[PDB]
Amino acid sequence: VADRYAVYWNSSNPRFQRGDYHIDVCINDYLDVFCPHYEDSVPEDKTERYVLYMVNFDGYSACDHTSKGFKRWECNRPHSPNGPLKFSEKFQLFTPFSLGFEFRPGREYFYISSAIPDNGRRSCLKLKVFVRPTNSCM
Ligand SMILES: *[C@@H]1O[C@H](CO)[C@@H](O[C@@H]2O[C@H](CO)[C@@H](O[C@@H]3O[C@H](CO)[C@@H](O)[C@H](O)[C@H]3NC(C)=O)[C@H](O)[C@H]2NC(C)=O)[C@H](O)[C@H]1NC(C)=O
């Protein structure tokens, strides 16, 4: 957890349950988000699915995924064949591709999700990521 940070994005995770999950990372580190994953023996009704978004602080604060940001990943395979669906975020300064994001050191970024079956629409799981300043990373 000094290059790759594992984040299990589901409501049974106490860190998300508490509603203030936050992590510090260094440029070039990776954030690996693991979508909810279940055994076939699971009741659907109890299968979590989410869309994950990156928003600004106000959107993060208000669980607003409609006003501004980007849809980043879709946790839509609760029974994915080889382990949970996993999305990776690399905190890099430059990206040569258009499907990517570039980060700046000494800045915080925000992520929130909306339930896919769209339930109780109001509260949300969320995550704050602070990219430490260059140097404050040894
Ligand atoms: C909801 O979030 C939970 C909170 O973490 C998930 O539980 C964690 O599952 C992890 C993966 O199965 C376990 O971590 C380790 O992951 C590495 C990476 O592949 C494995 O090698 C390890 O074997 C595995 N176990 C360890 C730590 O050695 C965690 O142990 C486990 N943590 C907790 C808090 O129980 C749930 O899976 C997730 N639930 C749903 C519905 O997806």
Short mmCIF file of all heavy atoms in Angstrom, two decimals, residues 9-74:
data_model
loop_
_atom_site.label_atom_id
_atom_site.label_comp_id
_atom_site.label_asym_id
_atom_site.label_seq_id
_atom_site.Cartn_x
_atom_site.Cartn_y
_atom_site.Cartn_z
N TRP A 9 -15.24 -0.86 -2.76
CA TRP A 9 -16.40 0.02 -2.86
C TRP A 9 -17.74 -0.67 -2.70
O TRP A 9 -18.39 -1.01 -3.69
CB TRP A 9 -16.34 0.75 -4.20
CG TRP A 9 -17.19 2.01 -4.23
CD1 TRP A 9 -18.55 2.07 -4.17
CD2 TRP A 9 -16.73 3.37 -4.23
NE1 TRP A 9 -18.97 3.38 -4.13
CE2 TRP A 9 -17.87 4.20 -4.16
CE3 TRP A 9 -15.46 3.97 -4.27
CZ2 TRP A 9 -17.80 5.60 -4.13
CZ3 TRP A 9 -15.38 5.38 -4.24
CH2 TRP A 9 -16.54 6.18 -4.16
N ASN A 10 -18.16 -0.88 -1.46
CA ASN A 10 -19.45 -1.51 -1.19
C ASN A 10 -19.85 -1.05 0.19
O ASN A 10 -18.99 -0.69 0.99
CB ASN A 10 -19.34 -3.02 -1.31
CG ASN A 10 -18.68 -3.66 -0.12
OD1 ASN A 10 -19.24 -3.64 0.96
ND2 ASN A 10 -17.48 -4.21 -0.32
N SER A 11 -21.16 -1.05 0.48
CA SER A 11 -21.64 -0.55 1.76
C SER A 11 -21.33 -1.38 3.01
O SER A 11 -21.62 -0.96 4.10
CB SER A 11 -23.16 -0.27 1.69
OG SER A 11 -23.93 -1.46 1.57
N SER A 12 -20.74 -2.56 2.85
CA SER A 12 -20.43 -3.37 4.03
C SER A 12 -19.06 -3.01 4.53
O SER A 12 -18.63 -3.52 5.56
CB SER A 12 -20.48 -4.87 3.71
OG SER A 12 -21.80 -5.28 3.38
N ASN A 13 -18.36 -2.16 3.77
CA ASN A 13 -17.01 -1.72 4.13
C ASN A 13 -17.17 -0.63 5.19
O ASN A 13 -17.70 0.45 4.90
CB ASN A 13 -16.29 -1.14 2.92
CG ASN A 13 -14.84 -0.83 3.20
OD1 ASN A 13 -14.44 -0.61 4.36
ND2 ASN A 13 -14.02 -0.80 2.15
N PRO A 14 -16.69 -0.87 6.41
CA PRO A 14 -16.82 0.11 7.49
C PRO A 14 -16.27 1.50 7.20
O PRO A 14 -16.80 2.48 7.69
CB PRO A 14 -16.15 -0.57 8.67
CG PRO A 14 -15.12 -1.43 8.02
CD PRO A 14 -15.86 -2.01 6.84
N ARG A 15 -15.21 1.57 6.41
CA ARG A 15 -14.59 2.83 6.06
C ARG A 15 -15.54 3.72 5.24
O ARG A 15 -15.49 4.94 5.36
CB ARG A 15 -13.30 2.57 5.27
CG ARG A 15 -12.17 2.02 6.11
CD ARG A 15 -11.05 3.04 6.21
NE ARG A 15 -9.98 2.71 5.28
CZ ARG A 15 -9.00 3.53 4.92
NH1 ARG A 15 -8.94 4.76 5.41
NH2 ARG A 15 -8.08 3.11 4.06
N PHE A 16 -16.40 3.10 4.44
CA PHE A 16 -17.36 3.84 3.61
C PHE A 16 -18.59 4.13 4.43
O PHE A 16 -19.18 5.19 4.32
CB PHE A 16 -17.77 3.03 2.36
CG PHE A 16 -16.90 3.30 1.18
CD1 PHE A 16 -16.14 2.30 0.62
CD2 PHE A 16 -16.81 4.59 0.65
CE1 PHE A 16 -15.29 2.57 -0.46
CE2 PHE A 16 -15.98 4.85 -0.40
CZ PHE A 16 -15.21 3.83 -0.96
N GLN A 17 -18.95 3.15 5.25
CA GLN A 17 -20.09 3.24 6.15
C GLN A 17 -19.93 4.52 7.00
O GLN A 17 -20.88 5.29 7.15
CB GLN A 17 -20.11 1.96 7.01
CG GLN A 17 -21.40 1.57 7.71
CD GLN A 17 -22.68 1.58 6.84
OE1 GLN A 17 -22.77 0.91 5.80
NE2 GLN A 17 -23.68 2.32 7.29
N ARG A 18 -18.73 4.75 7.52
CA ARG A 18 -18.45 5.93 8.35
C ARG A 18 -18.63 7.24 7.58
O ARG A 18 -18.70 8.32 8.18
CB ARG A 18 -17.02 5.90 8.88
CG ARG A 18 -16.68 4.79 9.85
CD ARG A 18 -15.22 4.93 10.29
NE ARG A 18 -14.96 6.25 10.85
CZ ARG A 18 -13.74 6.77 11.03
NH1 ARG A 18 -12.66 6.09 10.68
NH2 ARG A 18 -13.61 7.98 11.56
N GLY A 19 -18.61 7.15 6.25
CA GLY A 19 -18.81 8.31 5.40
C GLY A 19 -17.72 9.39 5.31
O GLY A 19 -18.02 10.49 4.85
N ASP A 20 -16.49 9.08 5.71
CA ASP A 20 -15.39 10.05 5.65
C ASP A 20 -14.08 9.40 5.17
O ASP A 20 -12.98 9.85 5.49
CB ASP A 20 -15.15 10.66 7.03
CG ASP A 20 -14.64 9.64 8.03
OD1 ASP A 20 -14.79 8.42 7.78
OD2 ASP A 20 -14.09 10.05 9.06
N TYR A 21 -14.23 8.35 4.39
CA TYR A 21 -13.10 7.61 3.85
C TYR A 21 -12.19 8.54 3.06
O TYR A 21 -12.65 9.22 2.14
CB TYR A 21 -13.65 6.50 2.97
CG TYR A 21 -12.71 5.38 2.62
CD1 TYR A 21 -13.20 4.23 2.03
CD2 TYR A 21 -11.33 5.48 2.84
CE1 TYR A 21 -12.36 3.19 1.65
CE2 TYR A 21 -10.47 4.43 2.46
CZ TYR A 21 -11.01 3.28 1.86
OH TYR A 21 -10.25 2.22 1.47
N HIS A 22 -10.91 8.58 3.41
CA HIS A 22 -9.95 9.45 2.72
C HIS A 22 -8.57 8.80 2.68
O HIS A 22 -8.21 8.07 3.60
CB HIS A 22 -9.83 10.80 3.41
CG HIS A 22 -9.03 10.75 4.67
ND1 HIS A 22 -9.49 10.13 5.82
CD2 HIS A 22 -7.78 11.19 4.95
CE1 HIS A 22 -8.55 10.18 6.74
NE2 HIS A 22 -7.50 10.82 6.25
N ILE A 23 -7.79 9.08 1.63
CA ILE A 23 -6.46 8.49 1.52
C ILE A 23 -5.48 9.47 0.90
O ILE A 23 -5.86 10.30 0.08
CB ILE A 23 -6.46 7.23 0.62
CG1 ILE A 23 -6.63 7.62 -0.85
CG2 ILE A 23 -7.60 6.32 1.02
CD1 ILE A 23 -6.62 6.43 -1.82
N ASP A 24 -4.21 9.36 1.30
CA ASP A 24 -3.16 10.23 0.76
C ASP A 24 -2.32 9.38 -0.15
O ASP A 24 -2.03 8.23 0.14
CB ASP A 24 -2.28 10.82 1.88
CG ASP A 24 -3.08 11.60 2.90
OD1 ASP A 24 -4.12 12.19 2.52
OD2 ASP A 24 -2.66 11.64 4.08
N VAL A 25 -1.92 9.94 -1.28
CA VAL A 25 -1.18 9.16 -2.22
C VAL A 25 -0.12 10.06 -2.81
O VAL A 25 -0.14 11.27 -2.59
CB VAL A 25 -2.10 8.60 -3.35
CG1 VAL A 25 -3.28 7.83 -2.75
CG2 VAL A 25 -2.64 9.74 -4.20
N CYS A 26 0.80 9.46 -3.53
CA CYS A 26 1.86 10.21 -4.17
C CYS A 26 1.62 10.08 -5.65
O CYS A 26 1.05 9.08 -6.12
CB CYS A 26 3.22 9.60 -3.83
SG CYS A 26 3.68 9.89 -2.09
N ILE A 27 2.04 11.11 -6.38
CA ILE A 27 1.95 11.08 -7.82
C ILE A 27 2.53 9.72 -8.26
O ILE A 27 3.50 9.24 -7.68
CB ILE A 27 2.78 12.19 -8.44
CG1 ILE A 27 2.07 13.53 -8.28
CG2 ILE A 27 3.10 11.84 -9.90
CD1 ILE A 27 0.76 13.63 -9.04
N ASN A 28 1.91 9.14 -9.27
CA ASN A 28 2.30 7.85 -9.81
C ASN A 28 1.79 6.64 -9.05
O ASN A 28 1.91 5.52 -9.52
CB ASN A 28 3.81 7.78 -10.02
CG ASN A 28 4.25 8.66 -11.17
OD1 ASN A 28 3.50 8.88 -12.12
ND2 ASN A 28 5.47 9.17 -11.09
N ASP A 29 1.23 6.87 -7.86
CA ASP A 29 0.65 5.78 -7.10
C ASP A 29 -0.59 5.34 -7.86
O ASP A 29 -1.02 6.02 -8.79
CB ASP A 29 0.21 6.26 -5.72
CG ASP A 29 1.30 6.17 -4.68
OD1 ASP A 29 2.44 5.83 -5.05
OD2 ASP A 29 1.00 6.42 -3.49
N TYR A 30 -1.18 4.22 -7.46
CA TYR A 30 -2.39 3.74 -8.10
C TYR A 30 -3.48 3.52 -7.08
O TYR A 30 -3.23 3.15 -5.94
CB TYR A 30 -2.18 2.39 -8.82
CG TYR A 30 -1.25 2.41 -10.00
CD1 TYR A 30 0.14 2.35 -9.83
CD2 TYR A 30 -1.75 2.41 -11.31
CE1 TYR A 30 1.01 2.28 -10.93
CE2 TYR A 30 -0.89 2.34 -12.42
CZ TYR A 30 0.49 2.28 -12.22
OH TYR A 30 1.34 2.20 -13.31
N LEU A 31 -4.70 3.78 -7.49
CA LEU A 31 -5.84 3.53 -6.64
C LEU A 31 -6.57 2.40 -7.35
O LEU A 31 -6.97 2.53 -8.51
CB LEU A 31 -6.73 4.76 -6.56
CG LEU A 31 -8.18 4.45 -6.23
CD1 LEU A 31 -8.28 3.97 -4.77
CD2 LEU A 31 -9.03 5.67 -6.46
N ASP A 32 -6.73 1.27 -6.68
CA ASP A 32 -7.48 0.18 -7.28
C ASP A 32 -8.84 0.07 -6.62
O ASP A 32 -8.94 -0.24 -5.44
CB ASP A 32 -6.73 -1.13 -7.14
CG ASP A 32 -5.47 -1.18 -8.00
OD1 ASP A 32 -5.55 -0.76 -9.17
OD2 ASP A 32 -4.41 -1.63 -7.51
N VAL A 33 -9.90 0.34 -7.38
CA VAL A 33 -11.22 0.22 -6.82
C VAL A 33 -11.84 -1.14 -7.15
O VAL A 33 -11.91 -1.53 -8.31
CB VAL A 33 -12.15 1.32 -7.33
CG1 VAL A 33 -13.48 1.27 -6.56
CG2 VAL A 33 -11.49 2.65 -7.15
N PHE A 34 -12.28 -1.85 -6.11
CA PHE A 34 -12.88 -3.15 -6.30
C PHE A 34 -14.37 -3.05 -6.12
O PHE A 34 -14.85 -2.71 -5.03
CB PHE A 34 -12.31 -4.17 -5.29
CG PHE A 34 -10.83 -4.47 -5.49
CD1 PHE A 34 -9.87 -3.62 -5.01
CD2 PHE A 34 -10.42 -5.61 -6.18
CE1 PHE A 34 -8.51 -3.87 -5.20
CE2 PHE A 34 -9.06 -5.88 -6.39
CZ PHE A 34 -8.10 -5.01 -5.89
N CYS A 35 -15.10 -3.36 -7.18
CA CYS A 35 -16.55 -3.32 -7.17
C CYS A 35 -17.13 -4.43 -6.31
O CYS A 35 -16.48 -5.42 -6.06
CB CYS A 35 -17.06 -3.52 -8.59
SG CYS A 35 -16.72 -2.17 -9.73
N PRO A 36 -18.40 -4.29 -5.87
CA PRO A 36 -19.04 -5.32 -5.04
C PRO A 36 -19.05 -6.65 -5.83
O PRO A 36 -19.44 -6.67 -7.01
CB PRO A 36 -20.46 -4.79 -4.83
CG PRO A 36 -20.31 -3.31 -5.02
CD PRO A 36 -19.31 -3.17 -6.12
N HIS A 37 -18.66 -7.74 -5.18
CA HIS A 37 -18.60 -9.03 -5.85
C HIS A 37 -19.23 -10.07 -4.96
O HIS A 37 -18.97 -10.09 -3.75
CB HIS A 37 -17.14 -9.39 -6.15
CG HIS A 37 -16.97 -10.53 -7.11
ND1 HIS A 37 -17.47 -10.49 -8.40
CD2 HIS A 37 -16.34 -11.72 -6.99
CE1 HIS A 37 -17.15 -11.61 -9.02
NE2 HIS A 37 -16.47 -12.37 -8.19
N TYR A 38 -20.04 -10.95 -5.54
CA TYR A 38 -20.73 -11.96 -4.76
C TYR A 38 -20.65 -13.40 -5.30
O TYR A 38 -20.22 -13.65 -6.42
CB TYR A 38 -22.23 -11.60 -4.65
CG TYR A 38 -22.52 -10.18 -4.20
CD1 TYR A 38 -22.46 -9.12 -5.11
CD2 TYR A 38 -22.83 -9.90 -2.88
CE1 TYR A 38 -22.72 -7.82 -4.71
CE2 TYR A 38 -23.08 -8.58 -2.46
CZ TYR A 38 -23.02 -7.55 -3.38
OH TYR A 38 -23.25 -6.25 -3.00
N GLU A 39 -21.12 -14.34 -4.48
CA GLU A 39 -21.18 -15.74 -4.87
C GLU A 39 -22.54 -15.85 -5.59
O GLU A 39 -23.42 -15.02 -5.36
CB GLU A 39 -21.13 -16.61 -3.62
CG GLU A 39 -20.18 -16.01 -2.59
CD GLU A 39 -19.59 -17.03 -1.64
OE1 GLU A 39 -20.38 -17.64 -0.87
OE2 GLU A 39 -18.35 -17.22 -1.66
N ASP A 40 -22.71 -16.85 -6.46
CA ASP A 40 -23.97 -16.97 -7.20
C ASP A 40 -25.17 -17.06 -6.29
O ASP A 40 -26.27 -16.66 -6.65
CB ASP A 40 -23.94 -18.19 -8.11
CG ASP A 40 -22.87 -18.08 -9.16
OD1 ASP A 40 -22.96 -17.16 -10.01
OD2 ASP A 40 -21.94 -18.92 -9.13
N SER A 41 -24.92 -17.59 -5.11
CA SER A 41 -25.92 -17.77 -4.07
C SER A 41 -26.45 -16.45 -3.48
O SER A 41 -26.96 -16.46 -2.36
CB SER A 41 -25.31 -18.61 -2.95
OG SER A 41 -24.11 -18.00 -2.47
N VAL A 42 -26.34 -15.34 -4.20
CA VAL A 42 -26.81 -14.07 -3.66
C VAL A 42 -28.03 -13.44 -4.37
O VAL A 42 -27.98 -13.10 -5.55
CB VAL A 42 -25.66 -13.05 -3.58
CG1 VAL A 42 -26.16 -11.74 -2.98
CG2 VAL A 42 -24.52 -13.63 -2.75
N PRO A 43 -29.12 -13.25 -3.61
CA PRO A 43 -30.47 -12.71 -3.85
C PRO A 43 -30.74 -11.48 -4.69
O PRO A 43 -31.80 -10.88 -4.53
CB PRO A 43 -31.01 -12.51 -2.44
CG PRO A 43 -30.32 -13.51 -1.65
CD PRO A 43 -28.92 -13.46 -2.16
N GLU A 44 -29.83 -11.06 -5.56
CA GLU A 44 -30.11 -9.87 -6.36
C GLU A 44 -30.50 -8.66 -5.53
O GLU A 44 -29.76 -7.68 -5.49
CB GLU A 44 -31.25 -10.13 -7.34
CG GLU A 44 -30.93 -11.06 -8.46
CD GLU A 44 -32.18 -11.40 -9.25
OE1 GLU A 44 -32.88 -10.45 -9.68
OE2 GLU A 44 -32.47 -12.60 -9.42
N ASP A 45 -31.68 -8.71 -4.93
CA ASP A 45 -32.19 -7.63 -4.08
C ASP A 45 -31.06 -7.12 -3.21
O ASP A 45 -31.03 -5.96 -2.81
CB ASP A 45 -33.27 -8.14 -3.12
CG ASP A 45 -34.50 -8.66 -3.82
OD1 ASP A 45 -35.33 -7.84 -4.29
OD2 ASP A 45 -34.63 -9.91 -3.90
N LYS A 46 -30.14 -8.03 -2.91
CA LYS A 46 -29.01 -7.72 -2.05
C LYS A 46 -27.68 -7.61 -2.78
O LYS A 46 -26.62 -7.74 -2.19
CB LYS A 46 -28.96 -8.78 -0.95
CG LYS A 46 -30.32 -8.93 -0.27
CD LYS A 46 -30.31 -9.82 0.96
CE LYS A 46 -31.72 -9.87 1.56
NZ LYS A 46 -31.77 -10.69 2.80
N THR A 47 -27.76 -7.36 -4.08
CA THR A 47 -26.58 -7.20 -4.92
C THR A 47 -26.37 -5.71 -5.21
O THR A 47 -27.20 -5.07 -5.88
CB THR A 47 -26.76 -8.02 -6.24
OG1 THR A 47 -26.03 -9.24 -6.12
CG2 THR A 47 -26.25 -7.28 -7.43
N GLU A 48 -25.27 -5.14 -4.70
CA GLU A 48 -24.98 -3.73 -4.95
C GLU A 48 -24.31 -3.47 -6.30
O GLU A 48 -23.40 -4.20 -6.73
CB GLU A 48 -24.08 -3.16 -3.87
CG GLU A 48 -24.71 -3.15 -2.46
CD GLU A 48 -23.71 -2.74 -1.40
OE1 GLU A 48 -22.87 -1.88 -1.70
OE2 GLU A 48 -23.77 -3.27 -0.27
N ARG A 49 -24.78 -2.43 -6.98
CA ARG A 49 -24.23 -2.00 -8.25
C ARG A 49 -24.15 -0.46 -8.17
O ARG A 49 -25.04 0.19 -7.60
CB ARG A 49 -25.13 -2.45 -9.41
CG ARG A 49 -25.39 -3.96 -9.40
CD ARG A 49 -25.99 -4.49 -10.70
NE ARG A 49 -27.23 -3.83 -11.09
CZ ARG A 49 -28.37 -3.88 -10.40
NH1 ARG A 49 -28.44 -4.57 -9.26
NH2 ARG A 49 -29.45 -3.26 -10.87
N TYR A 50 -23.06 0.09 -8.70
CA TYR A 50 -22.84 1.52 -8.65
C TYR A 50 -22.22 2.07 -9.89
O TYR A 50 -21.62 1.35 -10.69
CB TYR A 50 -21.87 1.89 -7.53
CG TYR A 50 -22.29 1.50 -6.15
CD1 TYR A 50 -21.79 0.34 -5.55
CD2 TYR A 50 -23.15 2.32 -5.40
CE1 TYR A 50 -22.13 0.01 -4.24
CE2 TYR A 50 -23.49 2.00 -4.10
CZ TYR A 50 -22.98 0.84 -3.53
OH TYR A 50 -23.34 0.52 -2.27
N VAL A 51 -22.37 3.39 -10.05
CA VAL A 51 -21.71 4.11 -11.12
C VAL A 51 -20.80 4.96 -10.25
O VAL A 51 -21.23 5.43 -9.20
CB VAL A 51 -22.64 5.07 -11.89
CG1 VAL A 51 -21.79 5.85 -12.87
CG2 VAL A 51 -23.74 4.30 -12.63
N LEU A 52 -19.55 5.12 -10.65
CA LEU A 52 -18.61 5.92 -9.86
C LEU A 52 -18.29 7.18 -10.62
O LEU A 52 -18.05 7.14 -11.83
CB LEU A 52 -17.30 5.15 -9.57
CG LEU A 52 -17.42 3.77 -8.90
CD1 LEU A 52 -16.24 3.59 -7.96
CD2 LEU A 52 -18.69 3.67 -8.10
N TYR A 53 -18.29 8.30 -9.91
CA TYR A 53 -17.99 9.59 -10.53
C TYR A 53 -16.90 10.34 -9.80
O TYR A 53 -16.66 10.17 -8.59
CB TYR A 53 -19.22 10.50 -10.49
CG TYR A 53 -20.50 9.90 -11.03
CD1 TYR A 53 -21.34 9.14 -10.22
CD2 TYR A 53 -20.92 10.17 -12.33
CE1 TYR A 53 -22.56 8.68 -10.68
CE2 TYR A 53 -22.14 9.71 -12.81
CZ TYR A 53 -22.96 8.97 -11.97
OH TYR A 53 -24.21 8.59 -12.38
N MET A 54 -16.26 11.23 -10.54
CA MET A 54 -15.25 12.09 -9.97
C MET A 54 -15.92 13.45 -10.07
O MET A 54 -16.34 13.85 -11.17
CB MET A 54 -13.96 12.03 -10.80
CG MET A 54 -12.81 12.73 -10.11
SD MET A 54 -11.23 12.47 -10.95
CE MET A 54 -11.48 13.48 -12.29
N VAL A 55 -16.03 14.15 -8.94
CA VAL A 55 -16.69 15.45 -8.86
C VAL A 55 -15.86 16.48 -8.09
O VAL A 55 -14.78 16.18 -7.56
CB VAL A 55 -18.02 15.32 -8.12
CG1 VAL A 55 -18.94 14.36 -8.86
CG2 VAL A 55 -17.78 14.76 -6.72
N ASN A 56 -16.37 17.70 -8.01
CA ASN A 56 -15.66 18.72 -7.27
C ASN A 56 -16.08 18.59 -5.83
O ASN A 56 -16.96 17.78 -5.49
CB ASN A 56 -15.97 20.13 -7.80
CG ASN A 56 -17.45 20.48 -7.69
OD1 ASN A 56 -18.22 19.83 -6.99
ND2 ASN A 56 -17.84 21.54 -8.39
N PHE A 57 -15.48 19.40 -4.97
CA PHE A 57 -15.79 19.33 -3.56
C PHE A 57 -17.25 19.53 -3.21
O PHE A 57 -17.77 18.83 -2.35
CB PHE A 57 -14.94 20.32 -2.77
CG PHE A 57 -15.18 20.22 -1.29
CD1 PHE A 57 -15.00 19.01 -0.62
CD2 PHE A 57 -15.63 21.33 -0.56
CE1 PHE A 57 -15.27 18.89 0.75
CE2 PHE A 57 -15.91 21.23 0.79
CZ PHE A 57 -15.73 20.01 1.46
N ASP A 58 -17.93 20.47 -3.87
CA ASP A 58 -19.34 20.72 -3.60
C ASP A 58 -20.15 19.51 -4.04
O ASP A 58 -21.12 19.16 -3.40
CB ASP A 58 -19.86 21.96 -4.36
CG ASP A 58 -19.34 23.30 -3.78
OD1 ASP A 58 -18.81 23.35 -2.66
OD2 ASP A 58 -19.48 24.32 -4.48
N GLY A 59 -19.78 18.90 -5.16
CA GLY A 59 -20.51 17.72 -5.61
C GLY A 59 -20.31 16.54 -4.66
O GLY A 59 -21.19 15.69 -4.46
N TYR A 60 -19.11 16.47 -4.09
CA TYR A 60 -18.75 15.43 -3.15
C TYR A 60 -19.55 15.68 -1.88
O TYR A 60 -20.21 14.77 -1.35
CB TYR A 60 -17.25 15.52 -2.85
CG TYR A 60 -16.78 14.81 -1.61
CD1 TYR A 60 -16.34 13.50 -1.66
CD2 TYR A 60 -16.77 15.46 -0.37
CE1 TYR A 60 -15.88 12.84 -0.50
CE2 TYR A 60 -16.33 14.83 0.78
CZ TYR A 60 -15.88 13.52 0.71
OH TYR A 60 -15.45 12.88 1.85
N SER A 61 -19.53 16.92 -1.41
CA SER A 61 -20.25 17.27 -0.18
C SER A 61 -21.74 16.99 -0.30
O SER A 61 -22.34 16.45 0.62
CB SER A 61 -20.06 18.76 0.13
OG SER A 61 -18.71 19.06 0.42
N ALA A 62 -22.33 17.36 -1.43
CA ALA A 62 -23.76 17.18 -1.64
C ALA A 62 -24.20 15.87 -2.30
O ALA A 62 -25.39 15.70 -2.58
CB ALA A 62 -24.29 18.37 -2.45
N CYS A 63 -23.27 14.94 -2.51
CA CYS A 63 -23.60 13.69 -3.19
C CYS A 63 -24.28 14.01 -4.54
O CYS A 63 -25.19 13.30 -4.98
CB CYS A 63 -24.53 12.82 -2.33
SG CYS A 63 -23.69 11.89 -1.01
N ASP A 64 -23.82 15.06 -5.21
CA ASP A 64 -24.38 15.49 -6.49
C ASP A 64 -23.64 14.88 -7.64
O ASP A 64 -22.49 15.23 -7.88
CB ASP A 64 -24.25 17.01 -6.63
CG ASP A 64 -24.92 17.55 -7.89
OD1 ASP A 64 -25.19 16.79 -8.83
OD2 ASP A 64 -25.15 18.76 -7.93
N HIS A 65 -24.25 13.98 -8.39
CA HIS A 65 -23.50 13.45 -9.50
C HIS A 65 -24.14 13.91 -10.80
O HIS A 65 -23.91 13.30 -11.85
CB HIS A 65 -23.46 11.93 -9.44
CG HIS A 65 -24.81 11.31 -9.50
ND1 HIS A 65 -25.62 11.21 -8.39
CD2 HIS A 65 -25.53 10.85 -10.55
CE1 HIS A 65 -26.79 10.72 -8.76
NE2 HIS A 65 -26.76 10.49 -10.06
N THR A 66 -24.94 14.98 -10.72
CA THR A 66 -25.63 15.53 -11.88
C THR A 66 -25.13 16.88 -12.36
O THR A 66 -25.21 17.18 -13.54
CB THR A 66 -27.11 15.76 -11.62
OG1 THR A 66 -27.65 14.67 -10.88
CG2 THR A 66 -27.83 15.90 -12.94
N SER A 67 -24.63 17.69 -11.43
CA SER A 67 -24.16 19.03 -11.74
C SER A 67 -22.82 19.21 -12.42
O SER A 67 -22.66 20.13 -13.20
CB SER A 67 -24.14 19.89 -10.47
OG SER A 67 -25.45 20.11 -10.00
N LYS A 68 -21.85 18.36 -12.14
CA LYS A 68 -20.54 18.54 -12.74
C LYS A 68 -19.57 17.44 -12.31
O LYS A 68 -19.52 17.07 -11.15
CB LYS A 68 -19.96 19.89 -12.32
CG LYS A 68 -18.65 20.24 -12.98
CD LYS A 68 -18.02 21.51 -12.38
CE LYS A 68 -17.89 22.62 -13.42
NZ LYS A 68 -17.17 22.22 -14.67
N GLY A 69 -18.79 16.94 -13.26
CA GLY A 69 -17.82 15.90 -12.99
C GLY A 69 -17.74 14.94 -14.16
O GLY A 69 -18.01 15.35 -15.30
N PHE A 70 -17.34 13.69 -13.91
CA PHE A 70 -17.31 12.70 -14.98
C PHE A 70 -17.71 11.38 -14.45
O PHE A 70 -17.33 11.04 -13.32
CB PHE A 70 -15.93 12.38 -15.53
CG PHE A 70 -15.02 13.50 -15.63
CD1 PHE A 70 -14.56 14.12 -14.49
CD2 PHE A 70 -14.54 13.89 -16.86
CE1 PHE A 70 -13.60 15.13 -14.56
CE2 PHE A 70 -13.59 14.88 -16.95
CZ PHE A 70 -13.11 15.51 -15.80
N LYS A 71 -18.40 10.63 -15.29
CA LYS A 71 -18.78 9.28 -14.96
C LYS A 71 -17.44 8.57 -15.19
O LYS A 71 -16.83 8.71 -16.28
CB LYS A 71 -19.85 8.78 -15.93
CG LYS A 71 -20.00 7.26 -15.99
CD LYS A 71 -18.94 6.62 -16.92
CE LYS A 71 -18.91 5.10 -16.82
NZ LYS A 71 -17.81 4.55 -17.62
N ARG A 72 -16.95 7.85 -14.19
CA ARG A 72 -15.66 7.22 -14.39
C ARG A 72 -15.70 5.74 -14.63
O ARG A 72 -15.06 5.24 -15.55
CB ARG A 72 -14.71 7.49 -13.22
CG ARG A 72 -14.24 8.94 -13.06
CD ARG A 72 -13.58 9.49 -14.33
NE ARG A 72 -12.43 8.67 -14.70
CZ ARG A 72 -11.29 8.64 -14.02
NH1 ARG A 72 -11.13 9.39 -12.93
NH2 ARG A 72 -10.33 7.81 -14.41
N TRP A 73 -16.46 5.02 -13.81
CA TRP A 73 -16.49 3.59 -13.91
C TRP A 73 -17.86 3.07 -13.58
O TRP A 73 -18.61 3.70 -12.87
CB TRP A 73 -15.47 3.00 -12.93
CG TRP A 73 -14.05 3.57 -13.05
CD1 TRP A 73 -13.15 3.36 -14.07
CD2 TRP A 73 -13.35 4.38 -12.08
NE1 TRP A 73 -11.93 3.97 -13.78
CE2 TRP A 73 -12.04 4.60 -12.58
CE3 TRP A 73 -13.71 4.92 -10.84
CZ2 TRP A 73 -11.09 5.34 -11.88
CZ3 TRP A 73 -12.75 5.66 -10.14
CH2 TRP A 73 -11.46 5.86 -10.67
N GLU A 74 -18.18 1.89 -14.09
CA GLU A 74 -19.48 1.31 -13.83
C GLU A 74 -19.32 -0.05 -13.16
O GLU A 74 -18.78 -0.98 -13.75
CB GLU A 74 -20.23 1.15 -15.14
CG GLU A 74 -21.63 1.64 -15.08
CD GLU A 74 -22.15 2.02 -16.44
OE1 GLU A 74 -21.43 2.72 -17.18
OE2 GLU A 74 -23.29 1.62 -16.78
#
